[PDB]
Amino acid sequence: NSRTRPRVGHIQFLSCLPLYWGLARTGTLLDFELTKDTPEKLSEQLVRGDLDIGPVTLVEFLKNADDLVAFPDIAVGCDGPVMSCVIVSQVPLDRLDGARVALGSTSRTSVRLAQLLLSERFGVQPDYYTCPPDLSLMMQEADAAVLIGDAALRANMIDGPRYGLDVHDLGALWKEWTGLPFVFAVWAARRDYAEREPVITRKVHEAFLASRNLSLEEVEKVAEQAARWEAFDEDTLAKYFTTLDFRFGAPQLEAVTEFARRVGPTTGFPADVKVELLKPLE
Amino acid sequence: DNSRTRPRVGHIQFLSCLPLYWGLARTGTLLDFELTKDTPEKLSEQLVRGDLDIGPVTLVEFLKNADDLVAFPDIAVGCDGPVMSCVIVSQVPLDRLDGARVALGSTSRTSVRLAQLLLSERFGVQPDYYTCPPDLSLMMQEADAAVLIGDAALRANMIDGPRYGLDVHDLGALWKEWTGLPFVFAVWAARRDYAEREPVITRKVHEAFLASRNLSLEEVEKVAEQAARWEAFDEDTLAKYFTTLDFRFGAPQLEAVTEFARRVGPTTGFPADVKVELLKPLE
Numbered sequence A: 001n002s003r004t005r006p007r008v009g010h011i012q013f014l015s016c017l018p019l020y021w022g023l024a025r026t027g028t029l030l031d032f033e034l035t036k037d038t039p040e041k042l043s044e045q046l047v048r049g050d051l052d053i054g055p056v057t058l059v060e061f062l063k064n065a066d067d068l069v070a071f072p073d074i075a076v077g078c079d080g081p082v083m084s085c086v087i088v089s090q091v092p093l094d095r096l097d098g099a100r101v102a103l104g105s106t107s108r109t110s111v112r113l114a115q116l117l118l119s120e121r122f123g124v125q126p127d128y129y130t131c132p133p134d135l136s137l138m139m140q141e142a143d144a145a146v147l148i149g150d151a152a153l154r155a156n157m158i159d160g161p162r163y164g165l166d167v168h169d170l171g172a173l174w175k176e177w178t179g180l181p182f183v184f185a186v187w188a189a190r191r192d193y194a195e196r197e198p199v200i201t202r203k204v205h206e207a208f209l210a211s212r213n214l215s216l217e218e219v220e221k222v223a224e225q226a227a228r229w230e231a232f233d234e235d236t237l238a239k240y241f242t243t244l245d246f247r248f249g250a251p252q253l254e255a256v257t258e259f260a261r262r263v264g265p266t267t268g269f270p271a272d273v274k275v276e277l278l279k280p281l282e
Numbered sequence B: 001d002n003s004r005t006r007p008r009v010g011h012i013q014f015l016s017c018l019p020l021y022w023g024l025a026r027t028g029t030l031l032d033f034e035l036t037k038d039t040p041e042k043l044s045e046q047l048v049r050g051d052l053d054i055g056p057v058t059l060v061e062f063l064k065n066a067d068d069l070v071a072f073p074d075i076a077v078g079c080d081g082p083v084m085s086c087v088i089v090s091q092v093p094l095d096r097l098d099g100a101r102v103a104l105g106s107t108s109r110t111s112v113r114l115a116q117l118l119l120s121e122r123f124g125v126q127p128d129y130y131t132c133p134p135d136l137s138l139m140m141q142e143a144d145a146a147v148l149i150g151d152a153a154l155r156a157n158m159i160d161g162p163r164y165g166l167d168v169h170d171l172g173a174l175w176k177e178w179t180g181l182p183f184v185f186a187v188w189a190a191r192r193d194y195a196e197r198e199p200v201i202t203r204k205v206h207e208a209f210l211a212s213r214n215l216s217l218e219e220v221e222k223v224a225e226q227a228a229r230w231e232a233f234d235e236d237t238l239a240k241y242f243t244t245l246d247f248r249f250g251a252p253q254l255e256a257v258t259e260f261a262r263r264v265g266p267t268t269g270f271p272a273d274v275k276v277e278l279l280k281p282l283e
Ligand SMILES: C=C(Oc1cccc(C(=O)O)c1)C(=O)O
Pocket: A013, A015, A039, A057, A058, A076, A077, A082, A084, A085, A106, A107, A108, A109, A110, A111, A148, A149, A150, A184, A185
């Protein structure tokens, strides 16, 4: 009946590879029982109780906000381009009305942001369908596709330029539309776990912040090492890691508030949903 | 995407390899791996069938597949005397086990074979063996003795045994008494096809393991202090366990492997003189 390590999720994509570096170098990993997977699986596992703490794609957090406690000061976001959330299209976006648009199944938030932009900014109503993320296949059978993660970064930096495909950065489209930054995923504890183990939850939160901070300082070391295992080179990875925005304070919460209000009534949660933050000790 | 992919590397989830995990994390080596954590018998099955490229292999399963695996020199999971986490728990003296029931934990391949070798060829008793999931409570309700490995064995050795007045015999000590030799329970190996396709990645993985192991030897007390917060064992117990384990794999350890293989080979599924191929260093 001894104390057991928290079950902690971790996004397998490159976006959170520097964070993984920090968790390893600080020794934090030895205080976790870590699960690596794609964002939609990690969100399903946390909501279903197979994890205690982990990253949650924003839309799924909002649909479950009464049962989750978000960690302050860490998130996966951007202020302008995010580079790894894109619309790849063979035509201008305003020509997508009634066209087929493939939505990568690993996404919940970026697909909704893309749908919001296309309808409310560009005024087109495509015929959406979900499918596994595969740019080559998606382009054969759809006129445009929404991708996240490594596949999106690959479409943005490699596939797009080679084949003359338009690649629209969803963070940039949102920044153009609203002037706001964007948050794609947060870290959260299950409410029942945070109330049963307040101290473990706090130490996990603080360890994430320290590991994140360390990864910011050693971004070039992380990029050099990771470049040996990717089609991206060191400069591209370092640019990607430094373009991503892992803050989660008042300006980022303002962005979440506005996004939630615009998509709630079309996504399945109240437009004024409450985001509960983990409170520090007095 | 035809870029080079990280090696798929297995890692024993038990406490025995927790300091090594610390070393792999602290050195940053983990970011050069695609890591899979599991029990020794699953990690062995995955490597043999091709779901991993490099990983720990319980000795008996390595020897049964020695033609298809290349062992890493100078790192292994072993002992010279007690190993602490491979035990026979018995309610009677070992010499009273002839015709008695002995439960063999299903997660083991090497320690169970070593226990059978000791009981038959050293003590001369012929128990009615059976395999079951590792659970000391159930095993003791139905058997006169049980063979355990991993955390469950360490728990029987340091906690359950003393509490219930059960004899706990250390399999490493029993073998040492019988032979004067150390013992190797698991080795690290690369699949032969992976080692021949990617010699340099295999070498760098091997070197990274040695460097992570060496660091974990230096920081054993830090690792025990951290791990004690999540285990029924305290820091002193974990530190004694980590320092009792022997992770060397040179000539004296290979001598032990050779003799163990000779005594059990023809009844376990490999030649008594099976050849152990070691990863060769560069000139
Ligand atoms: C930085 C990214 O933004 C994300 C992260 C996690 C989930 C989602 C989603 O769309 O559900 C988006 C990235 O995927 O690289």
